[PDB]
Design a protein around this ligand. Structure first.
Ligand SMILES: CC(C)C[C@H](NC(=O)c1cc2ccccc2s1)C(=O)N1CCN(C(=O)[C@H](CO)NS(=O)(=O)c2ccc(Cl)cc2Cl)CC1
Ligand SMILES: CC(C)CCC[C@@H](C)[C@H]1CC[C@H]2[C@@H]3CC=C4C[C@@H](OC(=O)CCC(=O)O)CC[C@]4(C)[C@H]3CC[C@]12C
Ligand SMILES: Nc1nc2c(ncn2[C@@H]2O[C@H](COP(=O)(O)OP(=O)(O)OP(O)(O)=S)[C@@H](O)[C@H]2O)c(=O)[nH]1
Lengths: 617, 190
């Protein structure tokens, strides 16, 4: 009777249901029998009834519920989960909440519907994973994400059952996590997201004063603030940063306080308990800066407390140590260069050290080798410090983090050769020296006047020049192969010499003498002319077009990128300090702005700023 | 504070008392008239060590048409109860041959707890007399002690639904096994 019952329930007719209870009683057939359930997805009568209905009044639900009650299988029937993959775990309560009908939600909850059921189907998974909609996999979270304040209010406080707001799904995300996940930067979405977030946080704090909801962390270890920062959702992030609660009862959980006003000047005291961490836990600032592929990183960096904190941190110790860094590195490079120049070609390495100059010469090599080893150790410590960032962190951006690794290798590699491979240690030592000299732009990144230059040269080099060089290499290969084939000698050495001559020509110097020996000289000259014309005239200076366009983008965003680079370098410098010293350099005050519910002082670290307003009269 | 939800699935050969075991856990009242073929969609509250756990209890059958849908109940399982009978020795030798490879096929790296049912029935006289007709004897508990070791069971226990002996401790052991975080990953690809 599955098809007939499905048709009856879909049509919404109530008279047809008459006589079903006697049939079930006589045949002792439960409403959850496999035959009744749809084989495709284990769907039952109730979800079909709730899916299709007229103005939210299908009118068949109470009769079916009474029938199930008479059969004595109400608990199993109401909360029967869907099987299969796409809609696994879905229940009747989720559907009732989705269709925005309060009456059916009340009915299901009163009759005993489970309120903690989790929907884990692939359709409910995040967008990037394959599911078109994600809401935290909970009824209350689903209601909150769909902008239904009345449903959330009723479900939180019900005489039958209550859905605790501090409940985590399989992913670990709680209601706030899901609300942030679906948050969008659109004008309309942000307003309701913030309103629901504030309402839910206030309710949770009111009901449970001891525990703060935002404290809970997901499996990834992030909090709603940290997750919003990582996902690039500025709309909720900025609101969370400057959250202020006027209510006296629950004003403790506020993040922005008022210090004092003198005339147009207003000084306010922000809180940064978790915004800045001295290695104790992950900080919003590090996640915002180091992480890649963030939609609105530049905008999120330009917030009231972030800029002031960066400025104060830079003034306190950043400038003092940055110049020390530059001086030490330049001195080491000068020592390395002097060691490289005064290298005795005569004799088999290693050499005996007996003379006065040996005292000075050996020290340079020892210092350079120890510096390379120190660089390698620093670069492995840093890699493990950031929890082993993947390829995207190293290769695509922060190229200097990789280059010093290469410099770390060669410098020590040569040493091995210097002990056994005496003959050819110079070949790689000189290349290491060149790379070390060339990779000093990391220290120039910080300077405001020349901060952009290094970033934009690194950007253009790998992206524009290589893309152009693909086509240039196509041309080079074709023309060089053609010219090599054409010439008549009357072979590897001849080909190499011809390639050398052609490269010398390509620079713009040399002489055109090859045509004399070859046959068909006229076509040879025609081909050379086409080569020169195409490459030099068009490509050589048409690359400059998009190169200048790239520099134009960098010029348009020069101020924004410099701020990012300066923040990166100062944070970099900070992170290498020991934990105890970092704690000794803590920034902010210990103002006891307010007392807890029991009266104990909060005594939380904060940071005060000030601004000027003239319209506040 | 906040109860943690864990998935428990009980798998065993027919007439082993898996449904009876879960029912006695549920209502602490042995049904002496009617026993459903499967007990589904139930969540029970349990506290072991300062933690509150909601255990979702799932059952699997193959009496009729349930074998085809049995695979659907394995995914996202947190703990498995490998269940057999002490009064039916045939329930033992079938555990490694067919049940274990399926368990490892669908849901690997999952804690498995061995359990034997009908502890009293092992000492019964009528059961022994009837069983001796085929040159068979009740299941020896020491044999179970070792059989747990062979299949790498987290722990092996005995239950008696009639006299509600060891049910609480057995399912508590199941839960403590579930809460365990396992060990990272093994031979993870580069
Ligand atoms: C000691 C503190 C007061 C400051 C600290 N400087 C040093 O420890 C040393 C400088 C010099 C100079 C000559 C010879 C020996 C040393 S030892 C400092 O401020 N930093 C080092 C850690 N940093 C890094 O490791 C970046 C970011 O992770 N990676 S890197 O590109 O590969 C790099 C950059 C510069 C230096 Cl130099 C070493 C490295 Cl691997 C950042 C910046
Ligand atoms: C336009 C650019 C970005 C692409 C070309 C890459 C260069 C690095 C190539 C172009 C021509 C090449 C040269 C062509 C011929 C030779 C001679 C060869 O050794 C010889 O002198 C041959 C004599 C012999 O072996 O008997 C060593 C490499 C060199 C300099 C080659 C090294 C690499 C060069 C400069
Ligand atoms: N002597 C003794 N017998 C028991 C005890 N507990 C259960 N039995 C029997 O075990 C049976 C367990 O029910 P059940 O597991 O559904 O049988 P089944 O036919 O194997 O179910 P299925 O796997 O084919 S779907 C009960 O019906 C009861 O008669 C016990 O503690 N002692």
């Amino acid at each position: 009777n599955r098809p007939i019952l499905f048709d009856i329930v879909s049509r919404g007719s109530t008279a047809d249901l008459d006589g079903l209870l006697p049939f079930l009683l006589t045949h002792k057939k439960r409403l959850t029998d496999e035959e009744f359930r749809e084989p495709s997805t284990g769907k039952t009568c109730l979800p079909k009834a709730l899916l299709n209905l007229s103005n939210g009044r299908n009118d068949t639900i109470p009769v079916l519920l009474d029938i199930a009650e008479r059969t004595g299988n109400m608990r199993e029937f109401i909360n029967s989960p869907f099987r299969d993959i796409y809609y696994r775990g879905q229940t009747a309560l989720h559907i009732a909440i989705e269709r925005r009908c309060k009456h059916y939600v009340e009915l299901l909850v009163a009759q005993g519907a489970d309120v903690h059921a989790q929907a884990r189907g692939r359709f409910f998974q995040p967008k990037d994973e394959g599911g078109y909609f994600y809401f935290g996999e909970l009824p209350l979270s689903l209601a909150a994400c769909t902008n239904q304040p009345h449903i959330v209010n009723y479900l939180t406080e019900n005489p039958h059952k209550k859905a605790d707001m501090r409940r985590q799904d399989s992913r670990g995300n709680t209601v706030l996590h899901a609300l942030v996940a679906i948050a969008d930067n659109t004008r309309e979405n942000t307003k309701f997201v913030t309103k629901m977030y504030d309402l839910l946080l206030l309710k949770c704090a009111r009901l449970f004063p001891d525990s703060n909801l935002e404290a809970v962390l997901n499996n990834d270890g992030l909090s709603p603030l940290m997750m919003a920062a990582k996902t690039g959702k500025i709309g909720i992030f900025q609101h969370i940063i400057r959250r202020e609660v006027t209510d006296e009862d629950t004003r403790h959980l506020s993040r922005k306080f008022k210090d004092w006003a003198y005339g147009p000047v207003y000084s306010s005291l922000y809180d940064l308990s978790s915004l800045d961490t001295c290695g104790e836990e992950a900080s919003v600032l590090e996640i915002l800066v180091y992480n890649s592929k963030i939609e609105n990183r530049h905008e999120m960096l330009a917030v009231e407390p972030i800029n002031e904190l960066l400025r104060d941190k830079w003034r306190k110790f950043g400038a003092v140590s940055f110049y020390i860094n530059v001086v030490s590195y330049l001195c080491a490079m000068v020592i390395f260069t002097l060691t490289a120049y005064y290298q005795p070609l005569e004799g088999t390495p290693p050499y005996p050290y007996r003379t006065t100059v040996d005292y000075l010469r050996l020290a340079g090599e020892v210092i350079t080798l120890f510096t390379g080893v120190l660089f390698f150790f620093t670069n492995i410590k840093d890699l493990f410090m950031k929890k082993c960032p993947g390829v995207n962190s190293l290769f695509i951006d922060g190229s200097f983090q990789l280059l010093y690794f290469i410099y770390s290798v060669l410098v020590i590699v040569s040493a091995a050769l210097y002990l056994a491979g005496i003959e050819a240690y110079l070949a790689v030592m000189v290349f290491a020296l060149v790379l070390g000299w060339m990779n000093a732009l990391y220290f120039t990144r910080g300077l405001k006047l020349t901060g952009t230059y290094s970033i934009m040269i690194q950007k253009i080099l790998f992206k524009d020049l290589f893309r152009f060089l693909l086509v240039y290499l196509l041309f080079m290969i074709g023309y060089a192969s053609a010219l090599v084939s054409l010439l008549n000698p009357c072979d590897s050495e001849t080909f190499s010499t011809f390639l050398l001559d052609l490269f010398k020509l390509t620079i713009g110097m040399g002489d055109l003498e090859m045509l004399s020996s070859t046959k068909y000289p006229v076509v040879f000259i025609i081909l050379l002319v086409t080569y020169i014309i195409l490459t030099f005239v068009l490509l050589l200076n048409m690359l400059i077009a998009l190169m200048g366009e790239t520099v134009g983008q960098v010029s348009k965003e020069s101020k924004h990128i410099w701020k990012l680079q300066w923040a990166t370098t100062i944070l970099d410098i900070e992170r290498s300090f020991p934990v105890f010293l970092r704690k000794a350099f803590r920034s902010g005050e210990m103002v006891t702005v307010g007392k807890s519910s029991d009266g104990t002082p909060d005594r939380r670290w904060c940071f005060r700023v000030d601004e000027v307003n003239w319209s506040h009269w | 504070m906040a109860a943690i939800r864990k998935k428990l699935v009980i798998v065993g050969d027919g007439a082993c008392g898996k449904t009876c075991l879960l029912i006695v856990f549920s209502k602490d009242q042995f049904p002496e008239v009617y026993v459903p073929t499967v007990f589904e969609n139930y969540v029970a509250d349990i506290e072991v060590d300062g933690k509150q756990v909601e255990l979702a209890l799932w059952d699997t059958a193959g009496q009729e048409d349930y074998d085809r849908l049995r695979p659907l109940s394995y995914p996202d399982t947190d703990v498995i109860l490998m269940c057999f009978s002490i009064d039916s020795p045939d329930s033992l030798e079938n555990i490694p041959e067919k049940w274990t490879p399926e368990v490892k096929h669908f849901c690997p790296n999952v804690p498995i707890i061995l359990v034997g049912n009908k502890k009293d029935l092992r000492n019964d006289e009528h059961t022994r007399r009837e069983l001796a007709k085929m040159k068979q004897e009740p299941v020896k508990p020491e044999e179970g002690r070792d059989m747990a070791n062979r299949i790498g069971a987290f722990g092996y226990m005995e239950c008696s639904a009639k006299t509600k002996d060891g049910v609480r401790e057995v399912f508590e052991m199941a839960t403590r096994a579930a809460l365990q975080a396992r060990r990272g990953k093994k031979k993870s690809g580069c």
